[PDB]
Amino acid sequence: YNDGYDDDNYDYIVKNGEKWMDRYEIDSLIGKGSFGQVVKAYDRVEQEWVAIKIIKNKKAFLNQAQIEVRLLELMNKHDTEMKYYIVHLKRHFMFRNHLCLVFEMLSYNLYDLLRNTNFRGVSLNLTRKFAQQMCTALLFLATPELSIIHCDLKPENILLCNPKRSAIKIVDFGSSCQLGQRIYQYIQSRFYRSPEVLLGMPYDLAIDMWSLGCILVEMHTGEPLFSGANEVDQMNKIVEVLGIPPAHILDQAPKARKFFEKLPDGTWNLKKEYKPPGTRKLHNILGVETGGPGGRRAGESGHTVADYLKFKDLILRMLDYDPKTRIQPYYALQHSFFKK
Numbered sequence: 001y002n003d004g005y006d007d008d009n010y011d012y013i014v015k016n017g018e019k020w021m022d023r024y025e026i027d028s029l030i031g032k033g034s035f036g037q038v039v040k041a042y043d044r045v046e047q048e049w050v051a052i053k054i055i056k057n058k059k060a061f062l063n064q065a066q067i068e069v070r071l072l073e074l075m076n077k078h079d080t081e082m083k084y085y086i087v088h089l090k091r092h093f094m095f096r097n098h099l100c101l102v103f104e105m106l107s108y109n110l111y112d113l114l115r116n117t118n119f120r121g122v123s124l125n126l127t128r129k130f131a132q133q134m135c136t137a138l139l140f141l142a143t144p145e146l147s148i149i150h151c152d153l154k155p156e157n158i159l160l161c162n163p164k165r166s167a168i169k170i171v172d173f174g175s176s177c178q179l180g181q182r183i184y185q186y187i188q189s190r191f192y193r194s195p196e197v198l199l200g201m202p203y204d205l206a207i208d209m210w211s212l213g214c215i216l217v218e219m220h221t222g223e224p225l226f227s228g229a230n231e232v233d234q235m236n237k238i239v240e241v242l243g244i245p246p247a248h249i250l251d252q253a254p255k256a257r258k259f260f261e262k263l264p265d266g267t268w269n270l271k272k273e274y275k276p277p278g279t280r281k282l283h284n285i286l287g288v289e290t291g292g293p294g295g296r297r298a299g300e301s302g303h304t305v306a307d308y309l310k311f312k313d314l315i316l317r318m319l320d321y322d323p324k325t326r327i328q329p330y331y332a333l334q335h336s337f338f339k340k
């Protein structure tokens with residue numbers, strides 16, 4: 001395989017200590033994905049640490065990574081400080097028949113941060129810092145020239161700049177596209193997957209705001225909001241919290257009847273275990289009136305009933321079933337939850 005450089009997965013066989021083009025010293029493997037691998041490397045020439053994404057030696061992944069490079073370079077062009085919430089691609093090159101994207105070195109992902117809380121969550125004040133940054137990132141992505149749908153927002157794809165600060169960036173535009181082909185695909189990681197995608201409808205940038213709402217509840221509670229074992233379980237768990245989707249959505253949805261039944265009067269209900277629809281209130285999940293998630297924020301700074309009510313209002317607006325009326329990033333940033 002590839003003069004002995006590749007395994008039977010078309011991944012490059014990483015050897016710690018290896019030196020590339022008399023410039024990069026491979027330190028270690030920090031990441032694996034469907035695209036290939038991510039390694040920590042010291043760039044001798046610029047005297048800095050870098051994350052090198054080594055794409056599999058297979059034309060499908062190489063072609064996809066060429067779109068990824070194009071989108072990252074498109075974002076890099078922009079003369080705005082909002083692009084500093086997106087991972088910086090420094091350059092790319094072909095090496096031993098692998099396309100390599102050289103990124104800035106970031107730190108732990110938000111999933112590592114949740115594991116460090118022992119899955120009990122971070123303060124509302126830290127959740128607020130992360131929410132403000134992520135809404136600015138999505139405001140940037142929805143710049144008309146860009147119109148980029150990330151398509152895979154989740155804690156694992158949000159990384160701290162460094163382990164000491166609250167500063168974060170979005171990584172992994174490997175699954176990303178520009179708005180244009182209004183088509184259905186099976187996309188987003190299941191826990192963070194929007195009702196429109198579950199329902200087989202075409203998607204737009206609002207799917208990233210759905211994911212963000214799920215992420216921010218999980219950051220504070222310590223656990224995924226909607227942890228489906230499959231699509232039916234995923235939709236059932238969404239309906240536990242938010243109730244039955246609007247009829248005008250289900251009437252247009254190719255996969256409506258995978259989860260719902262149309263009754264003789266044209267109203268819809270869940271198909272033939274689960275809490276009844278709308279019984280698992282976000283009010284109760286967040287512990288608005290009971291000192292936060294499992295009561296653990298009882299008498300803490302900036303954890304008032306009014307603080308929780310603002311958070312709950314913002315999340316409910318991000319978890320709108322209707323992608324047309326789902327809150328857009330600018331209006332999220334104007335939300336009273338951010339007024340301190």
Ligand SMILES: Cn1cc(-c2cc(C(=O)O)[nH]n2)cn1
Nearest residue numbers: 038051104105106107171172
């Ligand atoms: C620590 N670190 C990981 C990364 C990184 C970037 C990506 C990506 O864009 O796909 N994946 N991992 C950067 N720094």
